[PDB]
Design a protein around this ligand. Sequence first.
Ligand SMILES: OCC(CO)NC[C@@H](O)COc1cc2ccccc2c2ccccc12
Ligand SMILES: *[C@@H]1O[C@H](CO)[C@@H](O)[C@H](O)[C@H]1NC(C)=O
Ligand SMILES: [Co+2]
Ligand SMILES: [Co+2]
Length: 434
Amino acid sequence: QSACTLQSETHPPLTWQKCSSGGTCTQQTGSVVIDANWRWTHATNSSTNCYDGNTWSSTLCPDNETCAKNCCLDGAAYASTYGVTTSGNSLSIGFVTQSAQKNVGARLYLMASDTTYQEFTLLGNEFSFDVDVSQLPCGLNGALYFVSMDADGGVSKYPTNTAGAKYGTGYCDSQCPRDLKFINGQANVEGWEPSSNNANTGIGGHGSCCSEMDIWEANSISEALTPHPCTTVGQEICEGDGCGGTYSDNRYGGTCDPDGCDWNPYRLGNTSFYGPGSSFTLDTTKKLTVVTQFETSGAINRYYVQNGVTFQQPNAELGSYSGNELNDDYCTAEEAEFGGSSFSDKGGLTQFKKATSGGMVLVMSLWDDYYANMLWLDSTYPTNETSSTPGAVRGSCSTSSGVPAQVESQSPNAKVTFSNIKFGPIGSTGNPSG
Ligand SMILES: OCC(CO)NC[C@@H](O)COc1cc2ccccc2c2ccccc12
Ligand SMILES: *[C@@H]1O[C@H](CO)[C@@H](O)[C@H](O)[C@H]1NC(C)=O
Ligand SMILES: [Co+2]
Ligand SMILES: [Co+2]
């Protein structure tokens, strides 16, 4: 796709701190950009829609290449259309925003300049942020995560993408998403199937795969930490059901691991650690700090701070594993006790280390789940299981929760606020901000 300018594009600025081992930190100035799927896609020379509702223009977009030549992405009104704002080091995302139309959620990337994404090398480093999840009920996911996207949004590889990172192109993740409207500088109209339960979305014949580090998938009820390896580390197109992932008939038949090696304290048995109010170790009515450390062995460590009190990730015992470090003994034990082979099939933490050794893009989002109602995060899943099935219970939400139309109707003013991002060598991010 190209870019059009009927609507100006001004990325909301966002600062973060880069910390050094010597004990100081220095402020960095970036900004956020909304993913291309949320934008208006129209003809390059008029206001005619290329995509409207959950269908494509059959005349502008008769095939993937012609559509990309004929169509452009336009600018975003971040606050009034998308419910997105920033202030200093803080980013807020509203759930339902009513303007001339209804918008649900957003997926945002941290930039380095107005035309390039910021890349982070996680290995050997730690990432800290503060979050307020108090306004996130069952069924919503305020996510902070990394993906192995290109810094230019794909422009150097895909000449027919001239919009780039400035317009939020180039997304990929471990679900090999097929809901993207543009992949590899071409549209995804070929094979498009409109969603029966979502007036705005569909599934195309291609998907976009890459490694994904889910630092934080959470609401006020549940939270999880999940690495997802892929056999190709960075962005790569996939073909139809060969994609696997959420958007294919076969979830487990692709190059990425769409389930991951999740660490969810509630799921592992500590049902008292995280939740609303003073009966939980971390009170999700109040802001909390989340620190995630990527040691060079490939294991992942985690601690939290709230009201100046520090808590390591709670200990868990699962099969022959015992501890609080997410390491390949944990992930192997999790497959043996809870089931699955996807994570190990795709190379486990060894393969995942290839992603964290390289650059990844920071993603912050708020979404509801039109495929599984977020039950995999915060409820019992699959819903016919009970607490007697190991790992089935992920959180205390009802198995009836999270129907998109219902939570959009009941909780439109839900929101997430991410703030005070700090990044640097392990042990450095708790030192004074510059
Ligand atoms: O929040 C960011 C997303 C980026 O797309 N992170 C991964 C998320 O897509 C994982 O979703 C799932 C993760 C998952 C893990 C184990 C079992 C089932 C599921 C599942 C089932 C249906 C729909 C989704 C899932
Ligand atoms: C849950 O984890 C917290 C933090 O490690 C710990 O203080 C608490 O005792 C744990 N509770 C249970 C029931 O495991
Ligand atoms: Co193809
Ligand atoms: Co270690």
